[PDB]
Paper text:
The first class, which accounts for 47% particles, is a PCNA-FEN1 complex with a short DNA in the central channel of PCNA. In these structures, FEN1 binds to one monomer of the PCNA ring, and the other two PIP box accommodation sites are vacant. One strand of the DNA, which is the template strand, is continuous, and the daughter strand is disconnected at the catalytic center of FEN1, resulting in a ~90° bending of the bound DNA. The high-resolution density maps show that the phosphodiester bond of the 3′-end of the 5′-flap DNA in the catalytic center of FEN1 is broken, indicating that the DNA substrate is in the post-catalytic state. Interestingly, the DNA substrate in our structures is different from all previous ones: The cleaved 5′-flap remains stably bound in the enzymatic center, with the +1 nucleotide of the 5′-flap still basepairing with the template strand. During the 3D classification, the PCNA-FEN1 particles were grouped in eight classes for structural refinement. Two major differences on the bound DNA in these states are their orientations relative to the PCNA ring and the bending angles between the upstream and downstream dsDNA segments. The DNA was seen to have a rotation around the channel axis of PCNA. These states are named state A to state H based on the clockwise position of the downstream DNA in the side view. The angle between the upstream and downstream DNA in state A is 107°, and it increases to 129° in state H. By aligning PCNA in different states, the changes in DNA angles can be observed more intuitively. In conclusion, these analyses show that FEN1 is dynamic on the PCNA ring, which could undergo continuous conformational change to accommodate the DNA length variation between PCNA and the catalytic center of FEN1.
Numbering used by the authors:
A (entry chain D): 2 to 352
B (entry chain C), D (entry chain B): 1 to 255
C (entry chain A): 1 to 254
Write the structure that this text describes.
DNA sequence: TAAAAATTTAAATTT
DNA sequence: TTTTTAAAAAAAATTTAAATTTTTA
DNA sequence: TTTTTAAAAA
């Protein structure tokens, strides 16, 4: 994640953020950051502090969340692929350790919230104690396997494989909440996957091509810009934030002009500030080749999905039955062709 | 430096009510020979081709080929600020950040200036070639609103069949099985009820329905819908504005 | 091969817009001399009794006593496609469970065929006629819709008192205490706006009001309400459709 | 025993529909020679000053200066149970906690008896006098309702410029700069349409728009609005009911 | 001119 | 004074049941 | 993973 990238794009480029509707696409194949959806349905789905458990004492809130979200977005015509998180790299382990210490501090304050008897502090501090596990990864992968909706196991984090999926043209968008796919090279990034209410969080796109056209920068210039903003691999310069970085990239080139221009007393460079492979994995990540695997939005298996989703996870039959009949309604074929196949673009207009 | 004065004002209100719910980021290609809006849906499904020429404006005067791009929800609210009989005078300057709309009252007691600001906006232009369409049907517009609304009640897709005897709007879904045959008029010679089914070949195309509802929100602009299509080309839902031009709608068929 | 040429299709449209929210699944007991519907509601506290006889259709044809399960919200959304002057011709098949409805225009320009997906559900008869109804109130339906809509703002339970000089609608609650004494107005030469009453025994009994609001949505069907009630016997809200049949509405009082 | 038989019951219906969305708990300060209300239920100064004199009623008989507390949306619902041509009678027995509302239909068929369950509440009025209103405009209520209804789409701030030539309802916000000007039309034979301005010094006062929208939702009582304001005195939105009294609203300017 | 009817919001449950 | 860092605030979705606009004539 | 935002800071 990049601190303040979306605020910087909303300050600079309003033409690259397109607040669209949920139902507007109807056949635009998107790619989901799956673990972001697992956490977004693990914090948010609870009984006021009590997570959705089972008879076996294991949670099921992220399964119902992906169920309700994926049926509500396939009912609007969006065909997703859920790209899952794999192995985070060794350069990412510093901010991973900072998130681990944030979880340790939250688990420390959870004991004082339990001893103090505050009913709202204990909910807000069991919010931060979440963990994507391999049990959770296999459980979500098994649910999406019985969906008939494909999942791609990345060899790295899921943002880079989503960006490679959009860059190969196998999907048309990367439906991903954090802005790491813009610096991983995806031209299309939609955020805020709230298919329930349109007025709450509308779908806003992030055209990277429009960002690289109005700024005039190329891809690696935007990568070095997101470095001086600061990301989850490499730390930012102390004293350089969002407003300085547009000035320090926009009339400029790269890291080397910064380190031959900026004096190390006003804006000092941090010690052990690695960028040599942080730039390289951002341009060239360890991803899956999308021409190898084929996206198969197959028909769902019915009865074993009903019995696994209901009798093993304590669910009503009619809600899961309504979800699978809505998926079988939503998968009828009849792929909606776009207008760019028929009419050729003869330019644009300025203002 | 652009100034267009309309001697009837409700037509631009009907255009903005047509163009509110469909598209929001549209750039007005204003030339000296007319006012054009070539714009497209954000998900690349539907296209809007508005053409308002110089013969219907009472005082049209635009020097250079200046292009402005508004928020069509905001301009739809500004056109909702005018009444149905207000004389609308458009007003703009050279590279101006604000678009001025002067809604003059017809009985001259409410001259409401409206400086709506612009935004930095680009829309790509897709050139439609002049082509002969096979199923060119001209048919009533409130009837088209009835067909599109009452088949969007049923399902999400309308499979239009064109033949010699009449046009057939068929929609299928979980709700039932709609099948509306709309035959050719042989007795009524009035243009506002004539349903002409003139052909070159029979076609069978499947379109969407939310976009057809957004298309048939242009109902009060015209009585006749010159619904032009062929076997591969997207259909032309054309609303002939009275002596100003046409609001042309384009929608790609499902395959 | 059921076929029912109905000229005034707004009658059937107002039936299915009068039964869409009260009834979600119903059965159409199509006899050879009319069509019936004696379905229960969703909460199983009211009963909707509908009868359109075959003397009001233009042409009518039946071969069996076929009964079909029709989702009334589905058939209401299909009957929204017809116009207020469009004729409606129902069609049914023996082998296929489709209810085909073609909607011809008054002119010969627009034919709107509309099939259906019929559900499968059980049939049962709970009419029980000749219940010895003590009093009738034949009041206008717009007036009765005004009574139900005005009394619905106060509470959820209404008591209805009947007397010789008029009928008394009254409710209670936290929001107020209303009491409408709708009077004897048989002196009006318009019988259609007149209120006529006959009395054998004074009654006062607590009906529900939410399902009465569900009942009074048949006010575009007929512009009279033939409500008849008793002491412990459930009432009717009878909508006498003009030369076609009648639609009743039973509610056991609380 | 308070008695007020009002034959034009749509006046009280429109008063309660006006004060439904504005005031929730209002005291009905009933006098021996009129019916008065002075209350506010907003975080902003939203004083509503209602006069219903005894001369325009069909029968008035009150022998006490009683003032009852009314949950005003419930009385608004009960007044919405009335008809537009309905004779409305107000009764209030001394020892009862009920405001008895009796509706007599003009065909003498539907006779109602609603009892409004009162509650004990006391609020302190402020008492704005007629403190030399420098700029008063008399103008149609549909025009003012239209101006406030479409200027609320732009933003929240309406500045009201006035001079001898006309009144200017300028407004700006997040969307544009809407500048509705008017003209004093004393030559119109229609007196409800004839905009008349009596001005001493020009004024320009910023006002809120949601409270003024709630103020201008008292439209169909009167055809005209006696809108008056001064340099620092709060705004008066006056609806002079036809031989019944006035419904005066008070809006503090936003400095 | 009003009320069906499409639409939006908030609240308890979704376990 | 704009800005950068810092310490906080937070991550849905369905049915159910009023509420607020649009259209119908 | 996100946004604010109110103190600090060059």
């Amino acid at each position: 994640g990049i601190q303040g990238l979306a605020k910087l794009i909303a300050d600079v480029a309003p033409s690259a953020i397109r607040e669209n509707d949920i139902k507007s696409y109807f056949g635009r194949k998107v790619a989901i950051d799956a673990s972001m959806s697992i956490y977004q349905f693990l914090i948010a789905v609870r009984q006021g502090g009590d997570v959705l458990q089972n008879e076996e004492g294991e949670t099921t809130s992220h399964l119902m969340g992906m169920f309700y979200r994926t049926i509500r977005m396939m009912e609007n015509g969006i065909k997703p692929v859920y790209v899952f998180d794999g192995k985070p790299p060794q350069l990412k382990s510093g901010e991973l350790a900072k998130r681990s210490e944030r979880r340790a501090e939250a688990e420390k304050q959870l004991q004082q919230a339990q001893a103090a008897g505050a009913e709202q502090e204990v909910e807000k501090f069991t919010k931060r104690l979440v963990k994507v596990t391999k049990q959770h990864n296999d459980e979500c992968k098994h649910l999406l396997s019985l969906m008939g909706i494909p999942y791609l196991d990345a060899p790295s984090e899921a943002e880079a494989s989503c960006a490679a999926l959009v860059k190969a043209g196998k999907v048309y968008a990367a439906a991903t909440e954090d802005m790491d796919c813009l610096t991983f090279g995806s031209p299309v990034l939609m955020r805020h996957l709230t298919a329930s209410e349109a007025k709450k969080l509308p779908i806003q796109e992030f055209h990277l091509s429009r960002i690289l056209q109005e700024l005039g920068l190329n891809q690696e210039q935007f990568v070095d810009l997101c470095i001086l903003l600061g990301s989850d691999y490499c730390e930012s310069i102390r004293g350089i934030g969002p407003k300085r970085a547009v000035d320090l990239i926009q009339k400029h080139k790269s890291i080397e002009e910064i380190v031959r221009r900026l004096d190390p007393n006003k804006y000092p460079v941090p010690e052990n500030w690695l960028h040599k492979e942080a730039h390289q994995l951002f341009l060239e990540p360890e991803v899956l080749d999308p021409e190898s695997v084929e996206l198969k939005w197959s028909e769902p298996n019915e009865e074993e999905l009903i019995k696994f989703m209901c009798g093993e996870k304590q669910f009503s039959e009619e809600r899961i039955r309504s979800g699978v009949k809505r998926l079988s309604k939503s998968r009828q074929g009849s792929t909606q062709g776009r207008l760019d196949d028929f009419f050729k673009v003869t330019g644009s207009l300025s203002s | 430096m652009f100034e267009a004065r309309l001697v009837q004002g409700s037509i631009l209100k009907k255009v903005l009510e047509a163009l509110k719910d469909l598209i929001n980021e549209a750039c007005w290609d204003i030339s000296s020979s007319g006012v054009n809006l070539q714009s497209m849906d954000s998900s690349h499904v539907s296209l809007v081709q508005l053409t308002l020429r110089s013969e219907g404006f009472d005082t049209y005067r635009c020097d250079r080929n200046l292009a402005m791009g508004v928020n069509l929800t905001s301009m739809s609210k500004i056109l909702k600020c005018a009444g149905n009989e207000d004389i609308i005078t458009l007003r703009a300057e050279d590279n101006a950040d604000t678009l001025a709309l002067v809604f003059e009252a017809p009985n001259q007691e409410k001259v409401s200036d409206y400086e709506m600001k612009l935004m930095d906006l680009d829309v790509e232009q897709l050139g439609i070639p002049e082509q002969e369409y096979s199923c060119v049907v001209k048919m009533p517009s409130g009837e088209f609103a009835r067909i599109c609304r009452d088949l969007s009640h049923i399902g999400d897709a309308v499979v239009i069949s064109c033949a010699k005897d009449g046009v057939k709007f068929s929609a299928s879904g979980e709700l039932g099985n709609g099948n509306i045959k709309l035959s050719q008029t042989s007795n009524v010679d009035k243009e506002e009820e004539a349903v002409t089914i003139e052909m070159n070949e029979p076609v069978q195309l499947t379109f969407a329905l939310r976009y057809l509802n957004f298309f048939t929100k242009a109902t009060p602009l015209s009585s006749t819908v010159t619904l032009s299509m062929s076997a591969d080309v997207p259909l032309v839902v054309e609303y002939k504005i009275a002596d100003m031009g046409h609001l042309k709608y384009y929608l790609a068929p499902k395959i």
